[PDB]
Amino acid sequence: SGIVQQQNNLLRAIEAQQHLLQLTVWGIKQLQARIL
């Protein structure tokens, strides 16, 4: 039960990187637009 609850915790962390990756990209796009 713990391992499955954990693969879930990996899955969970990756999803959180996905939102953080999209946030970095937003920043980049704001710099692209401002600086060009």
């Binding site: 039960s1 499955v4 693969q7 879930n8 899955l11 990756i14 999803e15 996905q18 990756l21 999209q22 990209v25 796009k29 692209q32 060009l36």
Partner: protein
């Protein structure tokens, strides 16, 4: 170009957010298999 990149990112961030579909929907077979055991 930058819209070549915006497009090439978005599609790629599609593939990932497809994989994390496949994964999320094992995790919830695993959390079915765990039902039995």
């Amino acid at each position: 170009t930058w819209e070549a990149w915006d497009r090439a990112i978005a599609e790629y961030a599609x593939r990932i957010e497809x994989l994390i579909x496949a994964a999320q929907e094992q995790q919830e077979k695993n959390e079915x298999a765990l039902x039995e055991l």
